[PDB]
Amino acid sequence: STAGKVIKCKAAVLWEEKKPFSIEEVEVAPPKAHEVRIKMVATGICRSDDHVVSGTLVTPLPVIAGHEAAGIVESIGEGVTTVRPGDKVIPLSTPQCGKCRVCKHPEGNFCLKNDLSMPRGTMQDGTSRFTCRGKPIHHFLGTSTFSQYTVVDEISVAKIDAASPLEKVCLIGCGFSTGYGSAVKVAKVTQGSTCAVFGLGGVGLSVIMGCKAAGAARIIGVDINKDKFAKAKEVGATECVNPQDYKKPIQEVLTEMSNGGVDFSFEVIGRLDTMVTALSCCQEAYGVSVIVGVPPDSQNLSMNPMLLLSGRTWKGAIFGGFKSKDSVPKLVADFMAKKFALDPLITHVLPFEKINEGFDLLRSGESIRTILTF
Amino acid sequence: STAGKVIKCKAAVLWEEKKPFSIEEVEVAPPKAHEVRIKMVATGICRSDDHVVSGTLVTPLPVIAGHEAAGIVESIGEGVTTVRPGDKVIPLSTPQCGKCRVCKHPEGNFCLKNDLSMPRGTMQDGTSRFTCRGKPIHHFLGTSTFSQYTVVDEISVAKIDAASPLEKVCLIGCGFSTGYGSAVKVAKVTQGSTCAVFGLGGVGLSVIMGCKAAGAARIIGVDINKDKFAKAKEVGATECVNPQDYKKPIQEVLTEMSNGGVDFSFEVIGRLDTMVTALSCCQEAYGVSVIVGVPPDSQNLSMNPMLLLSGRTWKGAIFGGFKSKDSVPKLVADFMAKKFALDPLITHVLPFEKINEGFDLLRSGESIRTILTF
Ligand SMILES: NC(=O)C1=CN([C@@H]2O[C@H](COP(=O)(O)OP(=O)(O)OC[C@H]3O[C@@H](n4cnc5c(N)ncnc54)[C@H](O)[C@@H]3O)[C@@H](O)[C@H]2O)C=CC1
Ligand SMILES: NC(=O)C1=CN([C@@H]2O[C@H](COP(=O)(O)OP(=O)(O)OC[C@H]3O[C@@H](n4cnc5c(N)ncnc54)[C@H](O)[C@@H]3O)[C@@H](O)[C@H]2O)C=CC1
Ligand SMILES: O=CNC1CCCCC1
Ligand SMILES: O=CNC1CCCCC1
Ligand SMILES: [Zn+2]
Ligand SMILES: [Zn+2]
Ligand SMILES: [Zn+2]
Ligand SMILES: [Zn+2]
Numbered sequence: 001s002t003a004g005k006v007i008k009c010k011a012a013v014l015w016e017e018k019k020p021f022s023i024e025e026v027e028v029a030p031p032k033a034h035e036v037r038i039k040m041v042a043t044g045i046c047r048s049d050d051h052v053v054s055g056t057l058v059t060p061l062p063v064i065a066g067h068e069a070a071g072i073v074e075s076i077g078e079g080v081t082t083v084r085p086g087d088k089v090i091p092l093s094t095p096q097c098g099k100c101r102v103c104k105h106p107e108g109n110f111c112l113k114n115d116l117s118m119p120r121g122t123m124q125d126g127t128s129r130f131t132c133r134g135k136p137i138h139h140f141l142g143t144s145t146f147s148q149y150t151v152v153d154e155i156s157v158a159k160i161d162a163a164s165p166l167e168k169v170c171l172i173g174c175g176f177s178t179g180y181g182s183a184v185k186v187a188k189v190t191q192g193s194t195c196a197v198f199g200l201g202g203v204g205l206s207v208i209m210g211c212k213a214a215g216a217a218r219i220i221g222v223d224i225n226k227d228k229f230a231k232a233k234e235v236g237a238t239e240c241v242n243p244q245d246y247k248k249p250i251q252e253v254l255t256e257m258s259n260g261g262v263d264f265s266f267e268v269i270g271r272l273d274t275m276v277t278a279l280s281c282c283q284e285a286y287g288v289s290v291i292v293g294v295p296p297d298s299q300n301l302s303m304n305p306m307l308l309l310s311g312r313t314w315k316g317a318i319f320g321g322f323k324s325k326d327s328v329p330k331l332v333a334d335f336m337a338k339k340f341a342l343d344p345l346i347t348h349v350l351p352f353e354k355i356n357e358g359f360d361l362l363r364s365g366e367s368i369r370t371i372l373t374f
Numbered sequence: 375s376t377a378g379k380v381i382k383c384k385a386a387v388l389w390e391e392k393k394p395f396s397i398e399e400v401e402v403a404p405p406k407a408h409e410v411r412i413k414m415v416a417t418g419i420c421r422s423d424d425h426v427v428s429g430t431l432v433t434p435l436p437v438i439a440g441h442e443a444a445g446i447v448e449s450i451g452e453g454v455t456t457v458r459p460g461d462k463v464i465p466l467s468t469p470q471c472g473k474c475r476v477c478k479h480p481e482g483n484f485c486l487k488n489d490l491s492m493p494r495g496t497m498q499d500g501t502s503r504f505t506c507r508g509k510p511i512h513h514f515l516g517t518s519t520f521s522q523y524t525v526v527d528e529i530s531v532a533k534i535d536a537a538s539p540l541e542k543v544c545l546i547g548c549g550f551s552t553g554y555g556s557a558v559k560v561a562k563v564t565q566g567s568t569c570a571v572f573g574l575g576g577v578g579l580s581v582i583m584g585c586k587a588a589g590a591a592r593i594i595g596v597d598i599n600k601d602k603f604a605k606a607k608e609v610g611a612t613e614c615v616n617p618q619d620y621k622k623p624i625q626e627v628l629t630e631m632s633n634g635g636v637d638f639s640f641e642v643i644g645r646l647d648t649m650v651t652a653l654s655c656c657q658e659a660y661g662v663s664v665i666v667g668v669p670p671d672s673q674n675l676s677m678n679p680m681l682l683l684s685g686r687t688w689k690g691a692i693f694g695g696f697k698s699k700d701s702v703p704k705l706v707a708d709f710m711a712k713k714f715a716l717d718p719l720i721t722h723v724l725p726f727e728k729i730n731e732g733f734d735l736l737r738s739g740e741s742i743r744t745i746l747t748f
Contacts, residue, residue, distance in 0.1 A: 272679070286481050309665055310690065311692065314682060314689065315686065316679065
């Protein structure tokens with residue numbers, strides 16, 4: 001009934017920074033060659049979507065944001081081989097083209113077809129499939145999931161188990177896999193180690209899950225919102241500290257608590273000062289610190305390179321280091337085999353129409369992940 | 375005939391920054407418990423010794439500098455078990471106490487007994503073994519090798535092969551092992567990779583030797599002094615670039631030459647700007663950059679953390695990551711078995727009394743390593 005034909009549907013449009021999302025009708029074009037049109041079933045609210053609203057992350061406006069989601073293929077364009085109508089799918093904000101130097105490298109995952117380094121807010125072909133009030137609307141990270149339907153390039157979608165619960169596994173499309181992989185793949189946390197996790201939102205709790213799965217002996221959660229300590233302990237934190245409770249800098253607190261520095265630290269907030277504090281609190285000769293949080297646009301940090309010369313390792317990653325199209329179906333299979341839990345991340349489930357309330361919940365500190373259901 | 379007695383001998387004393395060394399008589403106390411007094415045979419001039427003169431590297435003055443050297447044990451204090459009078463030895467500017475958390479860690483080498491982080495310029499017991507003009511003189515990094523005799527703690531000396539040529543193997547005490555290990559141990563350069571080495575002095579040439587030993591396919595040397603290129607190519611560089619020859623920043627040049635970024639880069643100069651350029655020229659998703667050069671005291675660099683978030687790894691190390699007392703005798707053994715060459719690093723030889731001419735040669739750009747003979 002809809003294949004080959006323009007779909008009119010509801011979406012949340014962001015016309016301008018620092019405004020509520022506008023829920024209104026949009027026009028979704030049919031998929032061109034190597035494109036996939038998806039009916040959305042559930043989408044999570046990730047802090048990166050809020051960074052578009054706040055100006056922290058710059059991408060062309062107006063835009064349909066949303067990138068952490070799951071849905072069902074409505075139709076495919078000519079030449080698509082990896083998904084078919086009716087398949088359950090997760091869109092991928094980091095593509096996996098399989099052909100570039102990064103996709104061919106055993107470790108790398110930041111495929112050169114990504115829309116993050118030089119954001120265009122289009123399909124791979126440089127055009128948009130969305131119109132609203134007769135105006136073309138930009139895409140976001142090749143995903144755009146705050147819409148009843150979206151169109152994505154084939155390299156930005158993964159087919160998943162037909163029995164998957166989409167209102168939970170949408171988190172594997174971004175926040176869970178990012179945090180979990182940051183611990184198990186990027187840092188390679190070791191049995192018996194001491195970890196410090198700065199930021200106890202959805203991504204930080206997923207880092208804690210990964211540190212616990214790797215056998216860390218101590219996992220210290222750090223957040224300025226003490227309401228986020230109870231859930232952090234439930235998922236594996238052994239202690240939590242609030243920087244605002246201390247007269248001294250938290251890096252010195254954490255160094256003393258760890259008898260000279262932690263083995264692994266994670267910055268899962270997106271602040272320059274906490275990136276430098278997280279580096280400093282890892283042990284100077286052999287510690288490893290991983291940046292996960294998104295820094296504010298165009299701002300540089302300042303640090304003393306003696307922190308590195310003594311032997312620290314500093315790294316960052318997108319999407320937990322996972323090659324996205326290969327890994328997402330495997331992570332869904334692991335969840336269905338009960339290898340990890342997603343329910344601890346989900347504090348609110350709301351109809352899509354309540355998107356702005358979901359963002360208010362995030363900004364107020366009250367939620368971890370809100371899942372929006374279509 | 376000197377055991378247990380004060381030795382009067384010549385040393386090069388640095389009374390003030392930015393002044394020539396003063397070659398004059400000092401008094402060297404006999405070794406206390408767990409200390410070793412060494413008759414110096416040869417010492418190299420490492421840029422780090424010049425950094426003390428320039429104030430780039432802050433350590434208490436007045437001081438006996440020098441740290442890359444080899445000599446013969448004159449006497450041992452009570453309790454010394456790892457060397458005996460007559461043994462050939464190399465002093466270690468990074469100790470290996472064997473008892474701290476770093477010494478016990480499989481990767482770490484920056485032993486907590488070091489005198490680098492919070493310099494005191496003393497023996498481990500907090501006192502000095504040197505007097506000059508009746509005044510106490512500081513030690514440097516627990517070594518102080520610009521003297522006919524020095525006293526070191528047992529944890530800062532390694533026994534080496536009795537047949538070793540001391541006028542060559544002194545370089546294993548600092549510059550050779552630092553560069554070589556930075557490639558083979560810290561970066562873990564892989565076969566077929568592309569490497570970029572910033573700074574083609576003694577340490578950078580040793581990085582090139584390590585990259586070649588690791589089987590790198592391309593090794594790009596970077597220096598603003600084109601007179602350094604011929605020797606860089608002799609030891610393994612496949613190509614050399616002078617940043618001053620180009621209209622665009624060298625990170626852009628290197629990214630284009632490597633078809634999107636190098637696999638491994640090394641900063642082996644000691645400038646904040648080149649630390650950031652070297653990080654930037656490694657491939658954004660899977661590149662690794664190692665800081666080897668010493669930054670000017672207490673200065674911070676400025677960088678955009680998106681360079682790390684895409685996937686880069688940034689690390690530094692002291693002494694090529696080698697656990698010093700374990701590794702130095704094995705590296706001497708490997709040298710004696712012809713596994714690496716030191717002659718390419720030695721461009722000038724001088725008697726110790728011409729130390730100031732040796733520093734002039736380094737500062738003018740003319741030398742790689744000058745070896746001083748006592
Ligand atoms: N690298 C990647 O691939 C990904 C990066 N991100 C970024 O990770 C970050 C975290 O995302 P979420 O967990 O969704 O965000 P969130 O907002 O739910 O969690 C952030 C936590 O940081 C705490 N916090 C804020 N300022 C703090 C401070 N000075 N000190 C200590 N804690 C502080 C907050 O109270 C909150 O609990 C964001 O910057 C997000 O954009 C998210 C997913 C993918
Ligand atoms: N991490 C460690 O354990 C060690 C660190 N060091 C440090 O490594 C560094 C190199 O030491 P050496 O090889 O002895 O010094 P060196 O002075 O012989 O070599 C440095 C090279 O950098 C070149 N250079 C200077 N400015 C440059 C610029 N803007 N761009 C490109 N090239 C430039 C110079 O022309 C020179 O050839 C020094 O900072 C030294 O203190 C040395 C030994 C141990
Ligand atoms: O949350 C999804 N993607 C993020 C990844 C880090 C940079 C900003 C966008
Ligand atoms: O050259 C020898 N040691 C150096 C190591 C890096 C910091 C300054 C001292
Ligand atoms: Zn790719
Ligand atoms: Zn996200
Ligand atoms: Zn030690
Ligand atoms: Zn040195």
